[PDB]
């Protein structure tokens, strides 16, 4: 369960993109139990969900954002409230316009380590077939500089209405 996370993290970001990450977790969760459901939610869903703060970060890159949603239905009663896990899924953090220094910025391929860790634990909870309900949530995008990236000073609205 840990070595999955280490592999999700160690893989160069050009191979472990938003879509790729969601697809490896998806297969790893279904092999662990058929009491699972995966939703590799696209940009249009994220837009519909008014997740403007997440969308603001993903826009500078041409690599598509993904909002990964995992469910492990382990309780006897399906209506048991779940334990939810959330994880940061930046597949590469260059900093964007507030650009990072060159030295060792290659380790930023592991800035989706929040999404790797929690998703590996859901995969292992399901493998252990723990008698609980768990949702896994992970926004996945890259943070790049471009002619459409986020600019310092910009005000963006979160789902909850705060700016």
């Amino acid at each position: 369960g840990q070595n999955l996370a280490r592999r999700l993290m160690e893989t160069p970001a050009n191979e472990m993109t938003p879509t790729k990450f969601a697809e490896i977790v998806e297969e790893n969760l279904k092999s662990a139990s058929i009491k699972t459901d995966v939703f590799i939610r696209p940009k249009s869903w994220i837009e519909e969900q008014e997740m403007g703060s997440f969308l603001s970060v993903a826009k500078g890159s041409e690599e598509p954002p993904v909002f990964l949603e995992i469910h492990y239905k382990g309780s006897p009663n399906a209506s048991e409230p779940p334990l939810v896990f959330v994880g940061k899924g930046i597949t590469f953090d260059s900093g964007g316009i507030s650009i990072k220094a060159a030295a060792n910025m290659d380790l930023m391929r592991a800035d989706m380590g929040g999404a790797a860790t929690i998703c590996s634990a859901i995969v292992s909870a399901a493998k252990l077939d723990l008698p609980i309900n768990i949702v896994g949530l992970a926004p996945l995008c890259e943070n790049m500089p471009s002619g459409k990236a986020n600019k310092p000073g910009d005000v963006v609205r979160a789902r909850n209405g705060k700016t």
Binding site: D93, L107, M108, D111
Partner: peptide, 4 residues
């Protein structure tokens, strides 16, 4: 990752 910001730095500090």
């Amino acid at each position: 990752x910001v730095v500090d």
